[PDB]
Design a protein around this ligand. Structure first.
Ligand SMILES: [Zn+2]
Ligand SMILES: [Zn+2]
Ligand SMILES: [Zn+2]
Ligand SMILES: [Zn+2]
Ligand SMILES: [Zn+2]
Ligand SMILES: [Zn+2]
Ligand SMILES: [Zn+2]
Ligand SMILES: [Zn+2]
Lengths: 442, 76, 88, 87, 91
């Protein structure tokens, strides 16, 4: 089941070290080449001179690059016997004798560890089958759906997973323990869902979290029904506070403040002379959008970004001296890596009650933020990765989470039930919170 | 000092305040304009809800800052 | 659209300096070492303008499953870059 | 032709991109099949009642051993238990 | 000749217009759902083929992926390309 050509090369330690060195070199070049150089020098066939004639492969043995579409690397490997090439779009190693990629050798996939590999193999193992995607249910402990729904979006967030598995918190944590430390409790959940702590399995970390949460805020600890947005904001604030607590020497550099933080530009404009000061800059960790009388998410972003003339604001223009009602606009000044949206699914009525807004709002699988940034603006596309939905009324209900992982697959998280679900069915849910991750900036 | 609240419909309202005003006082001004009882209001600035027993200056809210008003969608 | 191509404007062949190649991709190392981390679909100038300068970025974070190994002693899931340090 | 060459350029971009996506998906599943001789896909249930293992909802009579008082507690009352037990 | 096509590609890269074509194509494919559809197709072809062999899988995915490109994306990108080509070829 492994390419025998590469295994044959790997019999000799030096030859093996040579392959890994060239693979490391090719991949370093692919991540550190400006776009023009990358096209001209990694995607241009040495024989037909076309750019992107299908995949272009960089030879392991000489400096030649050859294309897929005209069989030009295949010719190189028959003419000269250089049978291994690296695909310049993704760094993957192809065997031209097998006519297949070599994707199932851990050392090649993890080549940046080549020099440590002896120690890596013996002390660490590959994930176990059922744990490899961290999919696991969190039992309802009373009214914990507002917790678990958010927890599932967090442990499927690629930025939070990388952070946790990189041991950044663990390495620096002063308080040391999942009983007292809220961050350590989060890390124990990841430990349990993707690793081994070594029916009601895999609930230990979630119990630890319930305990930490009780010590800080009993209302958000799972006894009574609460808001999922409020719990979301509670968790990230605890992550940030842990980081401040752990610094030797107390714009923030913690994981929350480098991933979820953007800023809004609020401008107040003279309708007299178009004077554009003073503009105010407010940070945000999420955007809360009004939805009344709307049917699409873009229409809700339009509303948030729409000019308002302020009728209760006392304005005096410093340029023209006008006292007309000023024009107010919110624009996005800085975008975050992960855009979190809360739909304001609730209204207050002048008869002294509140009611949920149950309207379906259409949300797209990829979101362009270009038309919402203040101040040409390029395409800025985020991919939808998580949805928290609420069923019930304003005062009582239940939360479910939907999250997206590699390979296009969505899962539905409803307390202890984790289920497979099609993208099509996810797009029909009543979204309360939406989690979008940056994909493309032109 | 004048600050703004973006309310449940996205309509912005203006409040006259001082940095030493308590959050509970701010909520009572919003109640006067919107009719929403203070204990049902969540006021968000910079990713934090503003807590009763603290002041606008505790959160560095300055002139022409915008607060975002939400309610709670309870669930469990 | 069905219009035939006579040749490239000779004005253009001049401005741009337009057998098999002798280029080597291996010769790219020195300039690659001088170049900050690039993203294929995240324009660097746009990043500085619309994103925070300390922003964490993962290009295409769902292209593959999270890459990790599990510690034999403690069963902790470890990102590849954290393995050697964890091993004390 | 203008259309000739335009189509050729687009077909270079399209096939490049297809070949990139397909390589990434096939290496990934190659690794999974090698690494797990026993690999089965997550159960998908078009009736929407079974989980990723093909099991039904467990549903009550579930308990958790409380580490704080050493006593078993009904799972659905754990948060209410901890309110009293933690103080 | 074949030398013509490569010279033109080289022009489009040096002028920066190649990155513009390539980004715009990618943006539109992503937004119309085509990338996710190709991933779903590849998963299904692997299942049927009972093998992850790239040559076999690509020979069945590739023609269907090309057909899945919306007419909207295909014409918009062809236009953007055509406009770039008119600046540098003689008609
Ligand atoms: Zn082989
Ligand atoms: Zn070629
Ligand atoms: Zn070679
Ligand atoms: Zn800790
Ligand atoms: Zn922080
Ligand atoms: Zn004026
Ligand atoms: Zn360990
Ligand atoms: Zn107890």
């Amino acid at each position: 089941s492994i390419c025998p050509h590469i295994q044959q090369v790997f019999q000799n330690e030096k030859s093996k070290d040579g392959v890994l060195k060239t693979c490391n070199a090719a991949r370093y070049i692919l991540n550190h080449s400006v776009p023009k150089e990358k096209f001209l020098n990694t995607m241009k066939c040495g024989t037909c001179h076309e750019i992107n004639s299908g995949a272009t492969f960089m030879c392991l043995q000489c400096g030649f690059c050859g294309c897929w579409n005209h069989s030009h690397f295949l010719s190189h490997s028959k003419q000269i016997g250089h049978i291994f090439g690296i695909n310049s779009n993704n760094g993957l190693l192809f065997c031209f004798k097998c006519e297949d990629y070599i994707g199932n050798i851990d050392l090649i996939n993890d080549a940046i560890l080549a020099k440590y590999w002896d120690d890596v193999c013996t002390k660490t193992m590959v994930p176990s089958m059922e744990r490899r995607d961290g999919l696991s249910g969190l039992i309802n402990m009373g009214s914990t759906a507002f917790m678990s729904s958010i927890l599932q979006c967090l442990i499927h967030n690629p930025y939070f997973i990388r952070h946790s598995m990189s041991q950044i918190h663990s390495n620096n944590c002063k308080v040391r323990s999942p009983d007292k430390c809220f961050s350590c409790a989060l890390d124990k959940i990841v430990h349990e869902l993707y690793g081994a702590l070594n029916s009601t399995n895999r609930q230990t970390g979630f119990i630890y979290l319930l305990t930490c949460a009780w010590k800080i805020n009993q209302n958000l600890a799972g006894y009574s029904q609460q808001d999922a947005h409020e719990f979301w904001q509670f968790i990230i604030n605890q992550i940030h506070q842990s980081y401040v607590l752990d610094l030797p020497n107390a714009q923030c550099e913690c994981i929350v403040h480098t991933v979820f933080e953007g800023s809004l530009e609020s401008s107040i404009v003279c309708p007299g002379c178009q004077n554009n000061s003073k503009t105010t800059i407010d940070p945000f960790l999420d955007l809360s959008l009004d939805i009344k009388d709307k049917k699409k998410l873009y229409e809700c972003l339009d509303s948030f970004h729409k000019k308002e003339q302020l009728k209760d604001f006392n304005y005096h223009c410093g340029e023209c001296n006008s006292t007309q009602d000023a024009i107010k606009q919110l624009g996005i000044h800085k975008l975050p890596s992960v855009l979190v949206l809360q739909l304001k699914r609730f209204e207050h009525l002048l008869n002294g009650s509140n009611r949920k807004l149950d309207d379906f709002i259409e949300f797209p699988t990829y979101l362009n933020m270009k038309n919402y940034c203040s101040t040409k603006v390029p395409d800025i596309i985020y991919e939808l990765i998580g949805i928290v939905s609420h069923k019930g009324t304003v005062n009582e209900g239940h939360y479910i989470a939907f999250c997206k992982i590699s390979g296009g697959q969505w899962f539905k998280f409803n307390d202890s039930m984790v289920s497979s679900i099609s993208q099509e069915e996810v797009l029909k849910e009543q979204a309360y919170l939406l989690f979008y991750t940056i994909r493309q900036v032109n | 000092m004048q600050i703004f609240v973006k309310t449940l419909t996205g309509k912005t309202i203006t409040l006259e305040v001082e940095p030493s005003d308590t959050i509970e006082n701010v909520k009572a001004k919003i109640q006067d304009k919107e009719g929403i009882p203070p204990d049902q209001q969540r006021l968000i600035f910079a990713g934090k809800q503003l807590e009763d027993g603290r002041t606008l200056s505790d959160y560095n809210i300055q002139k022409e800052s915008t607060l975002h008003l939400v309610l709670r969608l309870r669930g469990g | 659209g069905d219009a035939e191509i006579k040749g490239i404007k000779p004005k253009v062949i001049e401005e741009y300096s337009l057998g098999p190649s002798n280029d080597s991709w291996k010769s790219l190392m020195s300039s690659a070492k001088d170049t900050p981390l690039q993203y294929d679909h995240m324009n660097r100038e746009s990043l500085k303008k619309y994103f925070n300068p300390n922003a964490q970025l993962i290009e295409d974070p769902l292209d593959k499953p999270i890459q990790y190994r599990v510690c034999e002693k403690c069963g902790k899931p470890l990102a590849l870059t954290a393995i050697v340090d964890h091993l004390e | 032709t203008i259309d000739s060459i335009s189509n050729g350029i687009l077909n270079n971009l399209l096939t490049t991109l297809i070949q990139d996506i397909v390589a990434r998906e096939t290496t990934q599943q190659q690794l999974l099949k090698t690494r797990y001789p026993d690999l089965r896909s997550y159960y998908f249930d078009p009736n929407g009642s079974l989980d990723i293992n093909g099991l039904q909802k467990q549903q009550s009579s579930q308990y958790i051993h409380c580490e704080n008082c050493g006593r078993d507690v009904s799972a659905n009352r754990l948060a209410a238990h901890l309110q009293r037990c933690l103080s | 000749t074949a030398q013509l096509k490569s010279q033109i590609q080289q022009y489009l890269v040096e002028s920066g217009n190649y990155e513009l074509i390539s980004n715009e194509l990618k943006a539109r494919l992503l937004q119309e759902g085509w990338v996710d559809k190709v991933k779903d197709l590849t998963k299904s072809e692997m299942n049927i083929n009972e093998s992850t062999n790239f040559t076999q899988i690509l020979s069945t995915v590739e023609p269907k992926a090309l057909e899945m490109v919306s007419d909207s994306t295909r014409e918009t990108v062809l236009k953007q390309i055509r406009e770039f080509l008119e600046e540098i070829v003689d008609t």
